[PDB]
Amino acid sequence: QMTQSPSSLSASVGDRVTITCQSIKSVYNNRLGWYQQKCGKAPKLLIYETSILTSGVPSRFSGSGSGTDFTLTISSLQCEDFATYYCAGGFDRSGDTTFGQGTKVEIKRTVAAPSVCIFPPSDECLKSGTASVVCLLNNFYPREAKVQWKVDNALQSGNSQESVTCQDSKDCTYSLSSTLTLSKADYEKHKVYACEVTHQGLSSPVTKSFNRG
């Protein structure tokens, strides 16, 4: 119900960034708070009553504003500050309270090439009908990465899933997991299984392969 600006932003480590929170009604008794939510985690109260820092929150965070216009400032942006930030306001004591729409914060860093691991299917899960080969791209930036699957150097499609972690709170990198799903018969038919990774940190695509057996 409260407007936040921008919807998402990006900056570099050490930059100063600002998130604005606007409301139609005026805030009652300075009841305006700023929460930070990291991936897969509950929101954490950073600022309460417009400008008071929660104990333990680094002094890099600060809050300002009044009435209908408020501001959260991160003076020295860090990799651990990757999160979605919300503002929450109360306009009376009868139940007029609401959150802001949120603002995503990404951090820019230098290019980092991934490390490629490959995992053959376990014989315990080969007892069912599905075999799953797992390719892992560890600690890379930027996010854009291409993962190609090869079975006896035959190129696969439509039989693979993938997910990416969020920006690591220490080195600003990402990690991707790709899973190739075949039937156990097709798995026992072929031997060479490879994943070819294309990322701008690599001068050439890096292929990790294993032979079934």
Binding site: R93, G95, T97, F119, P121, S128, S132, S175, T179, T181
Partner: protein
């Protein structure tokens, strides 16, 4: 002091969803407890609240289908949502206001980790845990389960923390979910997987 959340995990439409928020350990005297929910890929939405004097407030949309109460003998706050549809699928949080305000969102200083609620007609299925074997990767694959969460993946019962990346679950063409957790270690490793909706508790060693 923690706000332990408990829920059924997956429910079918038209059912009544019942969630509990238990205060583990004693802390402040007059604290209030509010319920927020977060739909997938969306923002925070205030459901309701209950103050230090048990005064219960409901958001405009929740007045006709949410009941919030307290059991003081258990230190257990209860939220009931009636006639649920797929639009009620969300992660539900309880949070504490240290001032005792039952209708304030500006100072929630302690949150529960949240409980997942998926409203669908599809059946619950338990996952299979597949091991995956100067520094090398290893991990575990939690495969073919529904609904998505509550799902927990720990390493060495919490001892292994550094280098551990637990990936977001993906929805496969089989209609089930697959999650993968990996740890990179210098060249005993056991992953503890807990899927509450199917009561699947498996410790697999890699």
């Amino acid at each position: 002091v923690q706000l332990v959340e408990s829920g059924p995990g997956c429910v079918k439409p038209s059912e009544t969803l019942s969630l509990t928020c238990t205060v583990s350990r004693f802390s402040l005297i007059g604290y209030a407890i509010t319920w927020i929910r977060q739909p997938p890929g969306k923002g925070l939405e205030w459901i309701g609240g209950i103050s230090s004097a048990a005064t219960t407030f409901y958001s405009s949309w929740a007045k006709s289908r949410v009941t919030i109460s307290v059991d003081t003998s258990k230190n257990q706050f209860s939220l009931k949502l009636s006639s649920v549809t797929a639009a009620d699928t969300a992660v539900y949080y309880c949070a504490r206001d240290p001032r005792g305000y039952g209708a304030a969102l500006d100072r929630l200083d302690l949150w529960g980790q949240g409980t997942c609620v998926t409203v669908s007609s599809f059946s619950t299925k338990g996952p299979s845990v597949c091991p995956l074997a100067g520094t090398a990767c290893l991990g575990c694959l939690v495969k073919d389960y529904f609904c998505e969460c509550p799902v927990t993946v720990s390493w060495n019962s919490g001892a292994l923390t550094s280098g551990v990346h637990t990936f977001p679950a993906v929805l496969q063409s089989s209609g089930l979910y697959s999650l993968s957790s990996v740890v990179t270690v210098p060249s005993t490793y056991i992953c503890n997987v807990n899927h509450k909706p199917s009561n699947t508790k498996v410790d697999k060693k890699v």
